[PDB]
Design an enzyme around this catalytic site. Structure first.
Site, PDB file in Angstrom:
ATOM      1  N   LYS A   1     -11.882  -2.553   1.514  1.00  0.00           N
ATOM      2  CA  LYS A   1     -11.323  -1.661   0.447  1.00  0.00           C
ATOM      3  C   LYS A   1     -12.254  -1.730  -0.757  1.00  0.00           C
ATOM      4  O   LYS A   1     -13.352  -1.194  -0.626  1.00  0.00           O
ATOM      5  CB  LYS A   1      -9.866  -2.042   0.254  1.00  0.00           C
ATOM      6  CG  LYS A   1      -9.138  -2.116   1.577  1.00  0.00           C
ATOM      7  CD  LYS A   1      -7.630  -2.346   1.486  1.00  0.00           C
ATOM      8  CE  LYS A   1      -6.986  -2.430   2.850  1.00  0.00           C
ATOM      9  NZ  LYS A   1      -7.536  -3.533   3.689  1.00  0.00           N
TER      10      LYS A   1
ATOM     11  N   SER B   1       0.832  -1.238   0.000  1.00  0.00           N
ATOM     12  CA  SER B   1       0.000   0.000   0.000  1.00  0.00           C
ATOM     13  C   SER B   1       0.854   1.272   0.000  1.00  0.00           C
ATOM     14  O   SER B   1       0.333   2.325  -0.469  1.00  0.00           O
ATOM     15  CB  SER B   1      -0.916   0.092   1.141  1.00  0.00           C
ATOM     16  OG  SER B   1      -0.166   0.380   2.293  1.00  0.00           O
TER      17      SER B   1
ATOM     18  N   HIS C   1      -5.095  -4.808  -1.213  1.00  0.00           N
ATOM     19  CA  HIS C   1      -5.129  -3.699  -2.199  1.00  0.00           C
ATOM     20  C   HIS C   1      -5.175  -4.231  -3.626  1.00  0.00           C
ATOM     21  O   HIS C   1      -5.252  -3.377  -4.557  1.00  0.00           O
ATOM     22  CB  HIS C   1      -3.949  -2.750  -1.987  1.00  0.00           C
ATOM     23  CG  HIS C   1      -4.055  -1.977  -0.712  1.00  0.00           C
ATOM     24  ND1 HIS C   1      -4.658  -0.740  -0.652  1.00  0.00           N
ATOM     25  CD2 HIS C   1      -3.695  -2.290   0.540  1.00  0.00           C
ATOM     26  CE1 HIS C   1      -4.604  -0.291   0.586  1.00  0.00           C
ATOM     27  NE2 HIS C   1      -4.021  -1.240   1.343  1.00  0.00           N
TER      28      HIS C   1
HETATM   29  C1  LIG Z   1      -1.937  -5.114   2.894  1.00  0.00           C
HETATM   30  C2  LIG Z   1      -2.952  -5.098   3.999  1.00  0.00           C
HETATM   31  N1  LIG Z   1      -3.266  -6.220   4.703  1.00  0.00           N
HETATM   32  C3  LIG Z   1      -4.169  -6.282   5.704  1.00  0.00           C
HETATM   33  C4  LIG Z   1      -4.801  -5.147   6.138  1.00  0.00           C
HETATM   34  C5  LIG Z   1      -5.780  -5.231   7.275  1.00  0.00           C
HETATM   35  O1  LIG Z   1      -7.089  -5.215   6.769  1.00  0.00           O
HETATM   36  P1  LIG Z   1      -8.392  -4.447   7.513  1.00  0.00           P
HETATM   37  O2  LIG Z   1      -8.328  -5.061   8.907  1.00  0.00           O
HETATM   38  O3  LIG Z   1      -9.616  -4.889   6.748  1.00  0.00           O
HETATM   39  O4  LIG Z   1      -8.112  -2.965   7.550  1.00  0.00           O
HETATM   40  C6  LIG Z   1      -4.560  -3.847   5.467  1.00  0.00           C
HETATM   41  C7  LIG Z   1      -5.278  -2.659   6.046  1.00  0.00           C
HETATM   42  N2  LIG Z   1      -4.902  -1.418   5.449  1.00  0.00           N
HETATM   43  C8  LIG Z   1      -5.340  -0.143   6.020  1.00  0.00           C
HETATM   44  C9  LIG Z   1      -5.366   0.822   4.831  1.00  0.00           C
HETATM   45  O5  LIG Z   1      -4.271   0.512   3.932  1.00  0.00           O
HETATM   46  C10 LIG Z   1      -4.303   0.306   7.027  1.00  0.00           C
HETATM   47  O6  LIG Z   1      -3.011  -0.176   6.704  1.00  0.00           O
HETATM   48  C11 LIG Z   1      -6.682  -0.152   6.830  1.00  0.00           C
HETATM   49  O7  LIG Z   1      -7.766  -0.758   6.117  1.00  0.00           O
HETATM   50  C12 LIG Z   1      -3.594  -3.799   4.364  1.00  0.00           C
HETATM   51  O8  LIG Z   1      -3.255  -2.658   3.715  1.00  0.00           O
END
Ligand SMILES: Cc1ncc(COP(=O)(O)O)c(/C=N/C(CO)(CO)CO)c1O
Ligand SMILES: Cc1ncc(COP(=O)(O)O)c(/C=N/C(CO)(CO)CO)c1O
Lengths: 394, 394
Positions: A243, A184, A212
């Site tokens: 997302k 990300s 992502h």
């Molecule tokens: C690669 C990856 N793997 C797992 C997660 C965790 O997912 P979630 O718990 O649904 O937010 C995120 C969460 N990402 C954020 C926005 O980018 C914070 O990092 C929150 O949804 C991610 O980017």
């Protein structure tokens, strides 16, 4: 008692300082739907800081599906999936994700974060090894930490480093490689062909985090393995629903025997309450729409290609992205905080990346596209970003 | 690649064996609301395996509140709270929980499990110590594991053991004690008066997990500190929304400076998407109802006192519970699986506790009360439990 606890938090002064300088722009309270414009403090603000890549949190069919699930199933399941927390609709969504990503089976988790904790904590154990890309998501580092294995980081997309580190390890041990699909921060894609070629030589399991990637890359948005044709070289496909899929939760998909082990052994599914009916129904309906309506992914990429071209044409310095995440370099923590706040106060929402997450000289703002963005909105935001970059002297 | 991964899961045969024997009763797919009766495979089943202690997942006002939040805010926030994921209604719920538990401030997490990962991972560090009751919830063990501190277990409610273990530690180190308030397995309550007296002598921070306490004990259900009068001796009150509060998510409440550190430093809030609007609105409305309508907690306790009396009168061997959780001892893993399945097939839902979670000779079924249970339903279930215990020869 608070003496020692007070000393532990005493040195954390950045939030105090941001607020006193009038620069604080974290936890901005939104008063409206997550959309291409959001209401903050009664004002309209262009949203270029979201992960709703397909704009689907406002889709009336997904809202109605969630509202209908509340009517039928109520507000919560009040238990873990393995006990009293499983619905017919959880199983339906697991079958439908299995089909979408081309795997035998899947198990849902109530968050994406918990979706990574599950397989990383419970498959590798004592005398085993987990290999992580050094830029892997925090949830992957944390999941790996919860294992009883040796966790080893390799250089970001550095296949020589991966290969060397795997070659050092005892033959008589299990190994699992876990990588973000799309990373990300900079929006770059894993070298899955070389990673899977190395995994195959060392018989290492491969897990890809497609948080992502789902709804962004691959056939009908089915993710990174789908993007490269490498379904048969990836053991576990992990995704989130927070997302593109416009909801909350996540899954791990793979071989029926592996998924059956996980659903019975992963503490983040045994000891955490299941997804709410509303989130299951909104995930199911979003997944139908992404497949049935190719427009969404096409428009996301029209917007990404347009915005990226416009930003490079205006002389912004962009990260090596391959996704709708457009990192814009600023290379000063103070300017990054200032730029973010000035944009917020002029009606543009971007996300800052600062120390200690990155070195000062790599501090940046992340400008993310959604399918529902217009070219008019992208133009207005870039016009304001040029003005604020000028005022901030970067 | 799957060679070594196949060997890692090869020995896990219990699920195969349960299914082949016709005993498997995990992930039972429910087709209806979580209520005092649930539909499974088109049949009606009495639910005595839930954590919805106040029966509120079916409350039409809470359903409507969630449905109204979906209409206004859509299906998800599509980001972490610190970036684009905060709503006015998240802040409103933090203020309202702060008020309910008598603390300055609170921070929400998208699950209860993540609510424990937050403070346990980020407050104690290198050269610090976390003291855990050996029966603490899995999420507390896992949260503590994510810290860079030394994690030390003490004997279950063993205040001499706690005191001894704290006395061994360097004076020049921070210490935090974390305990379940009500322990879910046996339903017993922490000795918070002695624990807080020891914490005060050693200047150790105190965190209580009130997952099973909120809506159950304390004034208007405000939890374990409230139950004992010890608000001023507890640094952090952690709760979940997945039990009495009929939703999904959780919080940590405490001093404004501590909560401000947490909301900016805890990886399970920085790197995980925020609670969905529907879950915020259902939590807000449930919290109003628990306070405004004392009937719910009163009826939960009428049902608990009735069921416990009836079970002891029938000669069941009960755990040392102080809560609506009634552990019924069976003391054979095979009989525990058999009893659970026979009850399921006769229309009674209970939760089994077996090896390896407990020793064979302490295997049991957990019979949990809800406020919405009738005496007629409790009588029918106990009648069936007597018949199945007779058939199973325990
Ligand atoms: C690669 C990856 N793997 C797992 C997660 C965790 O997912 P979630 O718990 O649904 O937010 C995120 C969460 N990402 C954020 C926005 O980018 C914070 O990092 C929150 O949804 C991610 O980017
Ligand atoms: C003391 C305590 N602390 C934290 C949690 C985690 O909360 P949640 O993620 O909302 O399920 C639970 C979850 N408890 C179960 C049912 O008892 C599984 O253990 C799932 O909701 C708990 O009992």
């Amino acid at each position: 008692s608070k003496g020692k606890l007070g000393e532990k938090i005493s040195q954390f002064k950045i939030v105090e300082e941001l607020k006193a300088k009038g620069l604080y722009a974290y936890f901005r309270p939104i008063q409206s739907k997550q959309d291409t414009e959001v209401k903050i403090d009664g004002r309209r603000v262009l949203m270029f800081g979201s992960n709703s890549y397909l704009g689907l949190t406002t889709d009336t069919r997904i809202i109605k599906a969630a509202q209908d699930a509340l009517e039928k199933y109520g507000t919560g399941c009040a238990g873990s999936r393995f006990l009293n927390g499983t619905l017919d609709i959880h199983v339906e969504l697991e079958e439908k994700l299995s089909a979408y990503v081309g795997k035998e089976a899947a198990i849902l988790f109530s968050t994406g974060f918990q979706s990574n904790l599950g397989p990383l904590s419970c498959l590798m154990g004592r005398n085993d090894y987990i290999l992580l890309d050094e830029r892997d998501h925090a949830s992957i580092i944390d999941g790996s930490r919860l294992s009883f294995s040796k966790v080893i980081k390799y250089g970001h997309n550095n296949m020589e480093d991966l290969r060397a580190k795997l070659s050092r390890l005892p033959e008589d041990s299990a190994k699992l490689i876990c990588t973000d699909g799309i990373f990300s921060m900079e929006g770059d894609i894993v070298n899955l062909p070389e990673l899977t070629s190395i995994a195959n030589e060392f018989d290492a399991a491969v897990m890809v985090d497609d948080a992502h990637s789902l709804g962004v890359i691959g056939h009908k948005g089915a993710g990174t393995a789908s993007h490269f044709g490498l379904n048969d070289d990836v053991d576990l496909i992990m995704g989130t629903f927070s997302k593109s899929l416009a909801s909350l939760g996540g899954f791990v998909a793979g071989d029926a025997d592996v998924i059956d082990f996980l659903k019975h052994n992963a503490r983040s599914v045994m000891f955490s309450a299941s997804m709410t009916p509303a989130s299951v129904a909104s995930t199911l309906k979003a997944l139908e729409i992404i497949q049935n309506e190719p427009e969404h992914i096409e428009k996301l990429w029209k917007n990404t290609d347009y915005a990226k071209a416009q930003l490079l044409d205006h002389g912004f310095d962009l990260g090596a992205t391959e996704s709708p995440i457009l990192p814009i370099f600023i290379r000063s923590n103070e300017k990054t905080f200032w730029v973010t706040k000035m944009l917020q106060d002029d009606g543009v929402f971007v996300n800052p990346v600062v120390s200690p997450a990155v070195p000062a000289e790599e501090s940046l703002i992340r400008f993310s596209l959604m399918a529902t963005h217009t070219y008019d909105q992208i133009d207005e935001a870039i016009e304001k970003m040029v003005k604020v970059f000028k005022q901030a002297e970067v």
